[PDB]
Amino acid sequence: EGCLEYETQLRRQFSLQHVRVIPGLADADVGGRLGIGAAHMLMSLLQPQQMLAIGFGEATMNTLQRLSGFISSQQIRLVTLSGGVGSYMTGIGQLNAACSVNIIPAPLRASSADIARTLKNENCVKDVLLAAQAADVAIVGIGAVSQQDDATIIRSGYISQGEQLMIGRKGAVGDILGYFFDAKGDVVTNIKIHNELIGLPLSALKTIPVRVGVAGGENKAEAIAAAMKGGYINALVTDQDTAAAILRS
Amino acid sequence: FEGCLEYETQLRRQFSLQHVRVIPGLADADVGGRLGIGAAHMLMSLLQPQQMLAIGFGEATMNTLQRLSGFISSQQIRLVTLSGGVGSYMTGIGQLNAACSVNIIPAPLRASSADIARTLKNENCVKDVLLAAQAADVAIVGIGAVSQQDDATIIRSGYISQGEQLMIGRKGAVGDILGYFFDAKGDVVTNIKIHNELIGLPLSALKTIPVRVGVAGGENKAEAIAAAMKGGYINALVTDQDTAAAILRS
Ligand SMILES: CC(=O)C(O)(O)[C@@H](O)COP(=O)(O)O
Numbered sequence: 087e088g089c090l091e092y093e094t095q096l097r098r099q100f101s102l103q104h105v106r107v108i109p110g111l112a113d114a115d116v117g118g119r120l121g122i123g124a125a126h127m128l129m130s131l132l133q134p135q136q137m138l139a140i141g142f143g144e145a146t147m148n149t150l151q152r153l154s155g156f157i158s159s160q161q162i163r164l165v166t167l168s169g170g171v172g173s174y175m176t177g178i179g180q181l182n183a184a185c186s187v188n189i190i191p192a193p194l195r196a197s198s199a200d201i202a203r204t205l206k207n208e209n210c211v212k213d214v215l216l217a218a219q220a221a222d223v224a225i226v227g228i229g230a231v232s233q234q235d236d237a238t239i240i241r242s243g244y245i246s247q248g249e250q251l252m253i254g255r256k257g258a259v260g261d262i263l264g265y266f267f268d269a270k271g272d273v274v275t276n277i278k279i280h281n282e283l284i285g286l287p288l289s290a291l292k293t294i295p296v297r298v299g300v301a302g303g304e305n306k307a308e309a310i311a312a313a314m315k316g317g318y319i320n321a322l323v324t325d326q327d328t329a330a331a332i333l334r335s
Numbered sequence: 336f337e338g339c340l341e342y343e344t345q346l347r348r349q350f351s352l353q354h355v356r357v358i359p360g361l362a363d364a365d366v367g368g369r370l371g372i373g374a375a376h377m378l379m380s381l382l383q384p385q386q387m388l389a390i391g392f393g394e395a396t397m398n399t400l401q402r403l404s405g406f407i408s409s410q411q412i413r414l415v416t417l418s419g420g421v422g423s424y425m426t427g428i429g430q431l432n433a434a435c436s437v438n439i440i441p442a443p444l445r446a447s448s449a450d451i452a453r454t455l456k457n458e459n460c461v462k463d464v465l466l467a468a469q470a471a472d473v474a475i476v477g478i479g480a481v482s483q484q485d486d487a488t489i490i491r492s493g494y495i496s497q498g499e500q501l502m503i504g505r506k507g508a509v510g511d512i513l514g515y516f517f518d519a520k521g522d523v524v525t526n527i528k529i530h531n532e533l534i535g536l537p538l539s540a541l542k543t544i545p546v547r548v549g550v551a552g553g554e555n556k557a558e559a560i561a562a563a564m565k566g567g568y569i570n571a572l573v574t575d576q577d578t579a580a581a582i583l584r585s
């Protein structure tokens with residue numbers, strides 16, 4: 087298996103604690119094979135009654151659906167890392183028998199930094215932000231500037247195409263929870279979406295001890311590498327082709 | 336010469352309701368459960384495939400929703416929230432689909448100031464859901480009562496304080512829908528700050544939705560349920576025998 091070998095190299099080069107590389111060769115159902123792979127990794131990492139913090143987007147929602155039965159049975163508590171309420175869970179498949187679900191009551195992005203700060207200070211939002219920063223495990227997707235128009239953050243209308251082009255001009259390669267960072271994994275400073283986001287910042291996300299990124303696609307390799315170099319994730323679930331590309335870059 | 340069938344009739348004609356269901360009072364059979372079943376069954380006969388249902392806040396509406404999820408799924412019903420108060424929506428909004436359409440106001444039920452509330456009402460993501468909610472075909476809400484004191488959902492969920500509830504009572508209010516409190520005649524009370532801090536649809540807008548089901552029981556809610564019908568906030572009711580009887584002697 088090329089996959090064990092890729093797992094070993096990624097694990098060594100990025101000093102990861104856990105890695106799964108999925109045969110991404112050459113089958114055309116990767117969005118779902120990823121969610122399966124991250125669900126399995128999360129099943130091995132969470133003990134009963136622990137708390138799992140969840141991120142925004144496609145790979146994490148897809149992962150969450152796979153994990154719904156493990157969630158009830160092991161009584162895992164869920165908490166949202168970001169605003170963007172409806173996009174979450176919204177059905178999701180349920181749970182219960184003492185399984186809490188804690189949701190930031192706010193959009194992902196406010197229209198101004200002033201309003202973002204106000205919302206962050208509301209009690210119902212502060213309470214969930216604290217919970218999230220206290221989780222045992224986090225699961226997040228990673229977005230890439232180079233996806234341009236396919237990016238979830240563009241297709242949800244959370245940023246404009248103009249914003250994305252300036253974000254790229256400014257040196258960003260990728261994002262986690264809407265926060266964008268450069269090739270060395272540092273969060274880019276002069277970007278106004280950052281102060282408009284309602285959720286946990288990246289510097290707080292790193293308090294969570296096990297942080298799993300699920301992301302594939304060759305156009306994400308640069309972004310995923312920079313996320314590992316920044317330390318925002320310390321475990322990775324991806325596919326072979328993406329794994330290859332990450333290593334070369 | 337009076338059981339549930341005549342209560343239904345009397346209620347229908349006293350308050351000019353289009354649909355009413357009064358469930359019999361039993362030994363200890365949990366009305367909250369049987370109210371949800373009754374209201375679910377009422378919504379099943381009223382919603383057509385692909386129509387949009389607006390959902391209120393609280394226990395009777397969540398109990399109803401859970402009983403209604405197979406019908407929501409098979410009939411492709413769209414759901415939309417009438418109020419903020421999001422993770423609370425989950426009970427509920429869980430156990431669903433996801434061949435869905437669930438529109439949720441991404442905001443809390445009550446903001447900590449009227450300015451903050453105005454600001455949230457004007458964010459795009461909220462404004463769009465508010466519009467959608469006012470255009471629903473059918474609404475399902477609960478009715479709260481000031482007489483319930485500390486057992487009211489709005490106290491147990493921490494959305495108002497005890498002092499607030501006392502002052503609200505002193506100002507003449509007898510009940511609420513969606514956190515808007517009204518007096519015995521069904522008029523929204525004037526000098527109440529929570530009103531300007533609520534994020535959801537107001538009561539005057541709720542009246543645009545053509546079929547509005549209230550679901551509510553217990554003798555302590557009788558005066559509130561009556562006021563809600565005199566206000567016109569609901570035009571269909573699901574309740575239990577004893578409650579229906581106390582209401583008729585309002
Ligand atoms: C918006 C955001 O958080 C992201 O970091 O841009 C995620 O959407 C990326 O995940 P995905 O490509 O799986 O949707």
Ligand SMILES: CC(=O)C(O)(O)[C@@H](O)COP(=O)(O)O
Nearest residue numbers: 393394395477479488513514
């Ligand atoms: C808070 C609110 O909107 C309300 O009208 O008081 C509802 O909670 C009342 O319904 P319930 O007693 O079923 O929870």
